Amino acid sequence: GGKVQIINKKLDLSNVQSKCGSKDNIKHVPGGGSVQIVYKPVDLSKVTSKCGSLGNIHHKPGGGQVEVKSEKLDFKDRVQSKIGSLDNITHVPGGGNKKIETHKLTFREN
Amino acid sequence: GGKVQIINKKLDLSNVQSKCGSKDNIKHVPGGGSVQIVYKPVDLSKVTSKCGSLGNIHHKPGGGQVEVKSEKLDFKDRVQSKIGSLDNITHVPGGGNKKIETHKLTFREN
Amino acid sequence: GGKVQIINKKLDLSNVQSKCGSKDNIKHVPGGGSVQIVYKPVDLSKVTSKCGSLGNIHHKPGGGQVEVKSEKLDFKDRVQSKIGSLDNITHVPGGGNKKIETHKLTFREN
């Protein structure tokens, strides 16, 4: 067989994390007078920190699926749109001090 | 068979986390006079910290699925839209001091 | 068989992370009076830090799938659009002090 032996003496292990994984000032603004939106933001961010870690010790792990880490993400979509007619008309007749803004987007970081 | 033996002496293990996983000032603003919205934000963020950890020790784990970590995410959508006619009309006749803003978005970080 | 032996003496392990994985000031602004949007931002960012780590120790792990890490991401989409007619008309007759802005985007980092 397989003998496993571990000897440790006068160790010193330290693991420090600071402000890890923080998410701040996130804005989600979809829409804008649209018709169909499939808004599915997906995040899988992993911030892993290990120190002095040991893996698994197995003797004859035989048969089928053993310590199998399986992750499946299925996001299948079926979106259909049937419209008779689409018009975006900005009809501005006459005369005067008119100021028209449509879908006005302004970003100012400063 | 397989013998496993672990000896430890005068260890010192430390694991420190600070402000970990914090989420602040998150804004979700969908809509805007739309028709159909599928708003499914999904997050799987993992912030893992380990120190002095040990895995599993198995003797003949044989047969079928053993210590299998299976994660399935199914988000299947079926969205249908049938509209006779779509009009966005900004009819501004006459004359005067008119100021029209439609879907006005302004971001000012400062 | 296979003998495994580990001897350690007077070790000193340190693992420090600071501001790791932080996400700040993220803006998602889709839309703009569109028709069909499939908005699926997907992130798999991994920030991994290890020190003094050990892998797994296996004796005859034979049979099937063993310690298999399988990740599947399926995002299949089927989007259909059938429209009779699409018009974007900015009809501005007459005469005056008119200022028309459509889909005006201005970014000012400063």
Condensed summary:
Chains A, B, C: Disulfide bonds join 20-51. The structure is a homotrimer of 110-residue chains. Chain A has 110 residues and is mainly β.
Taken as a percent bin, the fraction of beta residues of chain A is: over 45%
Radius of gyration of chain A over all CA atoms, rounded: 29 Å
The most extensive interface between chains reads: A-B, 110 and 110 residues
Q: Secondary-structure element order of chain A, as H and E?
A: EEEEEEEEEEEE
Percent range of helical residues of chain A? under 10%
Structural class of chain A: mainly beta
PDB class: protein fibril
Keywords: Tau protein, Amyloid fibril, protein fibril
Assembly: trimeric
Entry title: High-resolution map of tau filament from progressive supranuclear palsy (PSP) case 1
Describe the structure.
Chains A, B, C: The record marks 3, 19, 23, 27, 40, 46, 50, 60, 69, 72, 99, 104 as: Not glycated. Chains A, B, C: There is a cross-link at residues 10, 27, 40, 46, 50, 60, 72, 76, 82, 98, 104 (Glycyl lysine isopeptide (Lys-Gly) (interchain with G-Cter in ubiquitin)). Chains A, B, C: Residues 1-97 are annotated as: Microtubule-binding domain. Chains A, B, C: Glycans are attached at residues 9-10, 76, 82, 98. Chains A, B, C: It comes from Homo sapiens (Human). It is classed as protein fibril. The structure is a homotrimer of 110-residue chains. The first copy, chain A, has 110 residues and is mostly beta strands. Chain A has no helices and 12 strands. The first copy, chain A, has strands at residues 4-7, 13-16, 23-28, 36-39, 42-43, 46-51, 57-59, 69-74, 77-83, 86-89, 97-102, 105-108. Chain A is elongated. Chains in contact: A-B, A-C, B-C. At the A-C interface, β1, β2, β3, β4 and β5 of A face β1, β2, β3, β4 and β5 of C. β6 (46-51) of chain A pairs parallel with β6 of chain B, so a sheet runs across the interface.
